[PDB]
């Protein structure tokens, strides 16, 4: 009866930095994934463990929409079994990921003359992230032998680092808004379905 509010996610006014990705869960509604493919000309629209053409035929208990901003160079890392600072320290998808990665270039919104440095990504972590983990900690990273808890030595870094989005940047350095729809399927009944 009710159509799933995809406009709230893809058409949001503000977007989160990748280290603090936003999540909105979708249920008790109906989703046409073909209407959303052509909803806007998307940079990337790929899926894993499922295929885009069949998307309306499936049915899921819950659907989670995760949104954030990264470089175009780093859309490759938003995929199962990928390595890199974004996948290791900011947003990790599991090896058995079933869902879709949708991204588009957002230079017109997120870049700015003189540079936009408001978006951040985690630069250091003592571990690689576990799937769908979200670390927004701000605590001084200690790299090397000498400790830094109060010592404040050289080899101790503030964990988050700002992106530098210039409008004249190459396409790889330009900001991309990314939406990842994870298709959770459980033993409980389904709540979201194609027509």
């Amino acid at each position: 009866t009710n159509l799933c509010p995809f406009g709230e996610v893809f058409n949001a006014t503000r977007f989160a930095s990748v280290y603090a990705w936003n999540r909105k869960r979708i249920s008790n509604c109906v989703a046409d994934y073909s209407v959303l493919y052509n909803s806007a000309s998307f940079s990337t629209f790929k899926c894993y463990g499922v295929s885009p053409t069949k998307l309306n035929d499936l049915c899921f208990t819950n659907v989670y929409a995760d949104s954030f901003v990264i470089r175009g160079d780093e859309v490759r890392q938003i995929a199962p079994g990928q390595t890199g600072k974004i996948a290791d320290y900011n947003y990790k998808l599991p090896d058995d990921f079933t869902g879709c990665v949708i991204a588009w270039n957002s230079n017109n919104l997120d870049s700015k003359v003189g540079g936009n440095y408001n978006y951040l990504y985690r630069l250091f972590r003592k571990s690689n992230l576990k799937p769908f983990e979200r670390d927004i900690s701000t605590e001084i990273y200690q790299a090397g032998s000498t400790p830094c808890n109060g010592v404040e030595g050289f080899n101790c870094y503030f964990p988050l680092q700002s992106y530098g989005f210039q409008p004249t940047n190459g396409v790889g350095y330009q900001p991309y808004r990314v939406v990842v729809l994870s298709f959770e399927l459980l033993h409980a009944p389904a709540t979201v379905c194609g027509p």
């Epitope: 540079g115 001084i140 404040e152 050289f154 680092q161 992106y163 530098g164």
Partner: nanobody, 116 residues
Framework: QVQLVESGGGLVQAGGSLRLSCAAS????EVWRMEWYRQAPGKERE????????????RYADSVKGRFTISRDNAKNTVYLQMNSLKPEDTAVYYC???????????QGTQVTVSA
């Protein structure tokens, strides 16, 4: 258009004062961490001081803690390093670097000699 330029330095004696300035072009210096490095001729490069992005703190090596102080002038887009109570081992060439982590595309030094 991106570059860093070191100024200041020279000859001073044990107990003397000095201030080095690193003038950056092509980016605001407060958005990323800025660092000061030094390399004595025999030894390897050593990190001496660093000031994190925005107001997230300062970092000083044990070698120079309490004697050196790093600071940032957002108007002059310049990071300064004030060197007080200089000891003969502080002789080196002094370099500044941006911890841009590849968000830039840029990738000379100044000499400081302190006698006994």
């Amino acid at each position: 258009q991106v570059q860093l330029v070191e100024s200041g330095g020279g000859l001073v004696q044990a107990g003397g004062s000095l201030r080095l300035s690193c003038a950056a072009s092509g980016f605001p210096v407060e958005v990323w961490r800025m660092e000061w490095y030094r390399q004595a001729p025999g030894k390897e490069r050593e990190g001496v001081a660093a000031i994190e992005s925005y107001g997230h703190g300062t970092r000083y090596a044990d070698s120079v803690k309490g004697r050196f102080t790093i600071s940032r002038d957002n108007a002059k887009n310049t990071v300064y390093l004030q060197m007080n109570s200089l000891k003969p081992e502080d002789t080196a060439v002094y370099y500044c670097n941006v911890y841009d982590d590849g968000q830039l595309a840029y990738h000379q030094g100044t000499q400081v000699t302190v006698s006994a």
